[PDB]
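Hey, weird one. I pasted the Glutamine amidotransferase subunit pdxT sequence into the form twice and got a warning about non-standard characters only the second time. First submission, copied straight from the form history:
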Amino acid sequence: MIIGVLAIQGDVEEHEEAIKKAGYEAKKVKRVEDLEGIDALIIPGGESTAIGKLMKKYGLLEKIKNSNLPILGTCAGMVLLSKGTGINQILLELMDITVKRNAYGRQVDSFEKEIEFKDLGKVYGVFIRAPVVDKILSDDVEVIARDGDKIVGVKQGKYMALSFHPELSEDGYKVYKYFVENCVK
């Protein structure tokens, strides 16, 4: 099992380690050629617009849209997978959801708390500039995690989107394993 992690820019040693702990092989996807030979792709990150621009600039945008790869989008990845955010920006438009960016505001740096994952249990999630699901556009979109009235985790077939950064907590590997076992295998 080879799990690719999008990092056109940035360091993904944390994501790679979590993938290894989950029991899989990790692969850094920096350029379009790296997408070959992977079983799934994880799209992490903080600020979504910069990543959207990088995907287009280096061609990963159209390549991903042209693939049938299972994808786990975390934070920036949740935004990118969506079909709308209310603001004009580059999106993959794959998952049947719209997203509300900076759902918890921009005055607080971060927050950490246990999140109940559907059919799994509690996972420690680190939220930094976290977006949340707004509209759900399809009957096959499944809510897998909530934080109060906010939807912080959804699944649609081979796609999964989360508000927090799994790689920032010791529970990261559990989340990655949950994604692979339910969206890839």
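That's the output from the first submission. The warning seems to come from a hidden character in my clipboard, not from the data itself. Residues 84 and 98 are 4 Å apart (CA to CA).
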